[PDB]
Design a protein around this ligand. Structure first.
Ligand SMILES: *[C@@H]1O[C@H](CO)[C@@H](O[C@@H]2O[C@H](CO)[C@@H](O[C@@H]3O[C@H](CO[C@H]4O[C@H](CO)[C@@H](O)[C@H](O)[C@@H]4O)[C@@H](O)[C@H](O[C@H]4O[C@H](CO)[C@@H](O)[C@H](O)[C@@H]4O)[C@@H]3O)[C@H](O)[C@H]2NC(C)=O)[C@H](O)[C@H]1NC(C)=O
Ligand SMILES: *[C@@H]1O[C@H](CO)[C@@H](O[C@@H]2O[C@H](CO)[C@@H](O)[C@H](O)[C@H]2NC(C)=O)[C@H](O)[C@H]1NC(C)=O
Ligand SMILES: *[C@@H]1O[C@H](CO)[C@@H](O[C@@H]2O[C@H](CO)[C@@H](O)[C@H](O)[C@H]2NC(C)=O)[C@H](O)[C@H]1NC(C)=O
Ligand SMILES: *[C@@H]1O[C@H](CO)[C@@H](O)[C@H](O)[C@H]1NC(C)=O
Ligand SMILES: *[C@@H]1O[C@H](CO)[C@@H](O)[C@H](O)[C@H]1NC(C)=O
Ligand SMILES: *[C@@H]1O[C@H](CO)[C@@H](O)[C@H](O)[C@H]1NC(C)=O
Ligand SMILES: *[C@@H]1O[C@H](CO)[C@@H](O)[C@H](O)[C@H]1NC(C)=O
Lengths: 49, 49, 49
């Protein structure tokens, strides 16, 4: 199944056993992880257009 | 215990086997190299006695 | 480890056994609890500045 954010516990180490990932490809891996800051800029320019 | 994968003759290190078996008691968050030593030395001194 | 919002189930009583907390110090205890209403006012004044 696809993952959700409720299956991930946040710690501080991330040793070599993990999977190397960047910010943009995190959002297509897990569903409905929404950083609000990128979203609000979309409806801000859509409002004044 | 050394074999986990049927169709690949590579084998798992035994230190991974114990580190996995700690997680079923409680989910280990941060792991250190010092914790591996005190388990192992007490293990080896147990077999010698 | 630090707590997330997925470890807290919401009920209605909160007897004396609990921990007394106010709104502002709830947000530094638990990570990524985001009330959206305080956030959107920040990017609204940053947009028209
Ligand atoms: C049956 O079980 C007993 C109980 O564990 C074993 O006895 C242990 O034997 C080991 C090996 O000799 C001992 O471990 C060694 O301890 C040394 C220091 O001991 C002194 O200082 C400590 C405090 O720091 C005091 O508690 C202690 O009373 C002493 O005064 C270290 O020098 C050793 O480490 C050094 O060598 C190892 C490599 O061998 C390196 O890893 C270290 O870097 C270092 O240079 C060492 O770990 C242990 O103290 C004994 N326990 C007890 C209670 O006495 C038996 O060996 C075991 N029988 C067997 C296996 O047949
Ligand atoms: C994910 O990327 C990091 C960053 O390079 C990798 O960490 C390296 O691991 C090797 C092998 O242990 C070390 O020699 C390097 O020094 C490490 N780099 C850093 C910056 O710490 C990590 O192994 C990668 N994970 C993989 C490939 O699974
Ligand atoms: C958290 O605060 C509430 C509010 O005061 C505390 O509830 C009081 O508990 C005492 C002891 O049982 C009662 O005598 C008071 O009447 C209670 N007050 C109210 C308004 O109900 C609660 O005990 C506190 N929790 C602590 C200190 O752990
Ligand atoms: C990752 O962190 C580095 C270090 O600051 C930064 O330069 C880079 O932009 C970050 N990657 C992102 C935000 O995708
Ligand atoms: C969004 O941007 C604001 C402006 O700096 C910042 O305070 C906030 O923490 C950001 N939200 C995140 C990182 O989730
Ligand atoms: C807590 O509730 C009281 C009751 O309405 C309110 O006056 C107070 O402002 C609240 N505290 C907050 C919002 O931090
Ligand atoms: C944010 O404010 C609006 C405006 O009243 C309200 O309808 C909404 O419930 C608020 N969001 C909360 C309390 O999470």
């Amino acid at each position: 199944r696809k993952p959700q954010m409720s299956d991930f516990v946040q710690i501080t180490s991330c040793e070599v056993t993990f999977l190397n990932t960047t910010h943009t490809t995190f959002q297509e891996i897990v569903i409905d992880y929404i950083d609000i800051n990128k979203t609000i800029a979309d409806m801000l320019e859509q409002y004044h257009s | 215990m050394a074999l986990g994968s049927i169709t690949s003759a590579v084998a798992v290190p035994f230190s991974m086997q114990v580190q996995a078996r700690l997680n079923y008691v409680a989910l280990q968050t941060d792991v250190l190299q010092e914790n591996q030593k005190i388990l192992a030395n007490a293990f080896n001194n147990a077999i010698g006695n």
